[PDB]
Design a protein around this ligand. Sequence first.
Ligand SMILES: Nc1nc2c(ncn2[C@@H]2O[C@H](COP(=O)(O)O)[C@@H](O)[C@H]2O)c(=O)[nH]1
Ligand SMILES: *[C@@H]1O[C@H](CO)[C@@H](O)[C@H](O)[C@H]1NC(C)=O
Length: 246
Amino acid sequence: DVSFRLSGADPRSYGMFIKDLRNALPFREKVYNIPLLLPSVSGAGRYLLMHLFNYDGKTITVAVDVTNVYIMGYLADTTSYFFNEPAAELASQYVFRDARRKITLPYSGNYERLQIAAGKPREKIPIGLPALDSAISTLLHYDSTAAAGALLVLIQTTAEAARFKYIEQQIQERAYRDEVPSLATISLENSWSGLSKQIQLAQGNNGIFRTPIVLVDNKGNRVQITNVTSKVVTSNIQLLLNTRNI
Ligand SMILES: Nc1nc2c(ncn2[C@@H]2O[C@H](COP(=O)(O)O)[C@@H](O)[C@H]2O)c(=O)[nH]1
Ligand SMILES: *[C@@H]1O[C@H](CO)[C@@H](O)[C@H](O)[C@H]1NC(C)=O
């Protein structure tokens, strides 16, 4: 399991939690020195538990699929909550079995579905460590509309930060002040699958992407990523989705 406590959190402690979440995910090999997530894991071993504590010491436990860093559901006190999709239904066979009841949320975990339920796109929802405190507090007691925005914050401040050093650094800059995500943040979230696929295809193509990936960079400019010498590959991305799940 991994744990993060917002009471006493600072950029360094958050950074160390994100390093710890990455290291909790199994891999058999690295591609260009980046951990390649597994094609498949059978049974309860597919799920990492992340214990998150708000400023006041109240907690949820989040279930994460270690093949894709997708959040399946969470446990708040005696109630479990799972997204309305097959992977999360399967996860509910394995995790939070002792909950007194299981609620299926009225949406999948897809960004497009969560943004409709929340009534706003990611671009308009501040993120940061204070926003994660608020998200944990929101998820402690059921509210499906409020939970959708809380889950957008939770996904970006945990899973997206684990996938990209740049997004970890963005949340560190928001340790005490929330701010809507940068253009690059949104671009990297949207490009994780495509980048993962191109980096794996590059391994038999001399480090050259078979299909260049368009990103937004840290200055807000559109850039074409063509090969593994790009800073996105050498410094930024931290985990690869296996092409057997693309
Ligand atoms: N529940 C959940 N959804 C995510 C996560 N990361 C990204 N998504 C979003 O869920 C959707 C799945 O679609 P896809 O990844 O195939 O494009 C995407 O919008 C994707 O960016 C995550 O870590 N947990
Ligand atoms: C490979 O990527 C580097 C770093 O982004 C870039 O400077 C270089 O021009 C690329 N090579 C190509 C497109 O042949």
